[PDB]
UniProtKB/Swiss-Prot annotation:
Species lineage: Bacteria, Pseudomonadati, Pseudomonadota, Gammaproteobacteria, Enterobacterales
Function noted in UniProt: PPIases accelerate the folding of proteins. It catalyzes the cis-trans isomerization of proline imidic peptide bonds in oligopeptides.
Subcellular location per the Swiss-Prot or TrEMBL entry: Periplasm
Positions of transmembrane segments: none
Domain PPIase cyclophilin-type stretches: 1-161
GO molecular-function terms, A-Z: peptidyl-prolyl cis-trans isomerase activity
Catalyzed reaction equations: [protein]-peptidylproline (omega=180) = [protein]-peptidylproline (omega=0)
Domain of life where this protein originates: Bacteria
Activity regulation comment: Inhibition by cyclosporin A with a Ki of 25 to 50 mu-mol, a concentration 1000-fold higher than that required for eukaryotic PPIases.
Biological process, per Gene Ontology: protein folding
Protein family per UniProt: Belongs to the cyclophilin-type PPIase family.
Protein known as: Peptidyl-prolyl cis-trans isomerase A
Major localization class: periplasm
GO annotations of cellular component type: outer membrane-bounded periplasmic space; periplasmic space
Length: 165
């Protein structure tokens, strides 16, 4: 039932299983970007070793692709940012998520919805290629300044494809 998406990256393949019942808006928004080729030639622009990898915002030359309007935050769905989950990145406002996402390489309780924090909405999980996500998190990065956490050699999503049901 739940849709699967294959991210074919320059570092290996990652397959995601998206949670349509617990994050319908987030899953539909992500699928629209995947199906329209938006994630093709985007990078994992920020990585933190053993903790997270973030992508879905920038080309190899760091130009930010213009995303669609933002979506409602579904972090009150009860899904936690545990190792292997995929969640929507956003700015200060809870309803500001657009195309950027992050894959949790460790359990990040600080990203979870609570009574005083709206949190980051989890909408799926890695079902194959978690070793690729771990490897991407460990690549050499620029260390200080505006490019802190940016991989020194671009990690590119060559294609993002919804798989047959």
């Amino acid at each position: 039932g739940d849709p699967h998406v294959l991210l074919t990256t320059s570092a290996g393949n990652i397959e995601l299983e998206l949670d349509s019942q617990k994050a319908p808006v987030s899953v539909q928004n992500f699928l629209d970007y995947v199906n329209n080729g938006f994630y093709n030639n985007t990078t994992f622009h920020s990585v933190i070793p053993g903790y997270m990898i973030q992508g879905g915002g920038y080309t190899e030359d760091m130009q930010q692709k213009q995303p669609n309007p933002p979506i409602k935050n579904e972090a009150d769905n009860g899904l936690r940012n545990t190792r292997g989950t995929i969640a929507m990145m956003r700015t200060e406002d809870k309803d500001s998520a657009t195309s950027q996402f992050f894959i949790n390489v460790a359990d990040n309780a600080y990203a979870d919805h609570g009574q005083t924090r709206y949190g980051f909405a989890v909408f799926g999980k890695v079902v194959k290629g978690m070793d690729v996500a771990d490897k991407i998190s460990q690549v050499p990065t620029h260390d200080v300044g505006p490019y802190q956490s940016v991989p020194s050699k671009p990690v590119v999503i060559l294609s993002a494809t919804v798989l047959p049901g």
